[PDB]
């Protein structure tokens, strides 16, 4: 038995072999802050951007308390619960309080909005939303009001902040009570992907599963006690959460720094008073600090890690990282649906400069796959296929999505085109999948062509990526325009998504008007993209 349906456990044959192997420990995902606070109670584990600063003991206590607090409001045993924070540290105990409460975090970021929202809050049956009150001019507290409306189930809205008409976050506090544990074979938590498909898709990830994520990302990056860790992306992105993340630094026992914003005012302060030793960044925000370090007068000596992902960063600033910032360059390419790549910290540094990493697991398995779906030669691009003991065998109630997904054994389509070395390290070629990569955020061409259709002067929409020297791509929208209408220009059509509820990091660059698209009897976006030009 499990406690949630809607996904697809491992079949009992593999879950036995990750069992022995010593993936799967056996231990809830909370038992990472329970036992390091039990050996080292009295170590800095947070640091926010302030300067406050809480020791493991504290952090493990007050977890304890919000999640007696949430029980007193029947959050627990199983509900799925929508998280909305920016990177203070009001996001990492709850992130505990609500595993030790039975409740299922399902992680959002700060700048999704309404149409994002509302379908994760439907899909995942949510019954409680957490948000801040105001974050970067925009009340969020509006968008939970929204939410309610459309979602029945949202019992709870959380706000850290002025509440309003709903609950303090701080107020959800009680004295501790034993709670149960759950099983680690259980989902505990979902994470959220761009997905390729007209909505976007939730990932469970389990107690064991998640866990050694994070337990083997730890050993890959030399995370020990001594690691202070920055986190630049937002904190329920899977790179900057497990990948070792914050939680590979709670787990060895470092401290967990957590920075606004990646801008080099911010990072740059944070990483001189803290003394960061490693953070993880997006392309784009690696691009900036090497530029930065020309005209900022930080001392950034104490970084020994930097970890760039997310998309593929070139060459040439790669091999810029050691004289420019002082430290040592690892490349990941992960996803949050699993497998995990990253150069190792002795690699040779043509590896590094050259190549995103070589598969986390021992047991992760990779295949490399052309249009027919067979195996390529070796060292030929084709489709990355990938299975492992933290790989999902289905999104979350997605049955129809899985069907096209995976394959019949369990292998997960990544829509990546990579070529494999003969060390077994990868280098990303390209993409397969519709969704337009813009600086590390995933943008699910179906679902932005679906929302800039329902705009009433457009009939027909293909959203196309255009190459960016500095973001990797950028947004086309190519528009037919409505029967005897006309198509909206890029502000208006900007002006309308964002009232629509989406996402600003979905919003076209550029729009398009044409009167037909080419096709194959499909919208041929190889042949628009070129159409560009
Ligand atoms: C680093 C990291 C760690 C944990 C994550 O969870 C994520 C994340 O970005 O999660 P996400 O699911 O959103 O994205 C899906 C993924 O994004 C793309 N990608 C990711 N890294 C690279 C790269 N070094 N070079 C080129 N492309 C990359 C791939 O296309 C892939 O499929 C990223």
């Given at each position: ?285 690696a691009?900036?600090?090497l ?15 930097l970890?760039v ?8 600033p790669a091999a810029r990282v050691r004289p420019a910032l002082?430290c040592t360059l ?22 590094v ?181």
């Open positions: 038995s499990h406690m949630l349906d809607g996904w697809v456990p491992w079949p009992e044959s593999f879950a036995r072999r990750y069992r022995a192997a010593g993936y799967w420990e056996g231990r809830p995902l909370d038992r990472l802050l329970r036992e390091r606070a039990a050996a080292d109670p009295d170590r800095i584990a947070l640091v926010d951007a302030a300067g406050d600063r809480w020791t493991y003991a504290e952090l493990d206590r007050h977890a304890d308390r919000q999640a007696a607090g949430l029980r007193r409001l029947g959050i627990g045993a199983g509900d799925r619960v929508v998280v909305q924070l920016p990177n203070t540290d009001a996001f990492v105990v709850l992130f505990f309080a609500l595993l030790r409460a039975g409740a299922v975090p399902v992680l959002t970021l700060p700048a999704h909005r309404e149409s994002e929202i509302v379908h994760v809050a439907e899909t995942a049956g949510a019954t409680a939303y957490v948000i801040p009150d105001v974050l970067d001019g925009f009340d969020h507290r509006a968008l939970a009001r929204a939410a309610r409306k459309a979602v029945p189930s949202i019992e709870h809205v959380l706000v850290a902040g002025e509440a309003a008409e709903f609950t303090a976050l701080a107020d959800v506090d009680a004295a501790p009570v034993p709670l149960a544990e759950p099983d680690p074979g259980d989902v505990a938590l979902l994470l959220l992907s761009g997905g390729t498909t007209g909505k976007p898709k939730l990932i469970p990830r389990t107690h064991d599963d998640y866990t050694y994520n994070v337990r083997a990302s730890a050993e890959v990056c030399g995370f020990d006690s001594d690691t202070v860790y920055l986190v630049v992306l937002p904190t329920a992105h899977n790179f900057a959460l497990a990948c070792p993340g914050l939680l590979g630094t709670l787990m060895v026992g470092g401290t967990v720094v957590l920075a606004p914003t990646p801008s080099p005012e911010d990072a740059f302060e944070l990483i001189e008073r803290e003394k960061v030793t490693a953070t993880a960044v997006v392309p784009p925000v691009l900036l600090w530029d930065a370090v020309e005209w900022e007068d930080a001392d950034l000596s104490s970084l020994r890690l970890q992902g997310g998309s593929k960063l070139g060459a040439e002082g690892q490349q990941v390419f992960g996803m949050a649906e699993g497998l995990l790549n990253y150069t190792r910290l002795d690699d040779p540094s043509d590896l400069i050259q190549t995103q990493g070589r598969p986390l697991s021992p047991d992760d398995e990779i295949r490399v796959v052309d249009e027919d779906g067979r195996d390529v030669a070796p060292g030929e691009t084709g489709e990355l296929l990938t299975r492992g003991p933290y790989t999902l065998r289905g999104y979350y109630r997605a049955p129809e999505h899985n069907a096209r997904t995976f394959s019949d054994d369990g292998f997960y389509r990544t829509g990546d085109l990579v070529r494999v070395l003969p060390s077994g390290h990868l280098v990303v070629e390209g993409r397969a999948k519709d969704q337009i990569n813009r600086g590390g955020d995933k943008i699910s061409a179906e679902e932005l062509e679906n929302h800039i259709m329902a705009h009433p002067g457009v009939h027909d929409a293909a959203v196309v990526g255009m190459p960016d020297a500095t973001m990797g791509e950028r947004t086309c929208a190519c528009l037919v325009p409505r029967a005897g209408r006309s198509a909206p220009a890029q502000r208006e059509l900007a002006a309308f998504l964002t009232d629509r509820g989406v996402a600003a990091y979905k919003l076209p660059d550029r729009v398009e008007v044409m009167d037909a698209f080419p096709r194959t009897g499909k919208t041929d976006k190889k042949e628009l993209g070129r159409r560009i030009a």
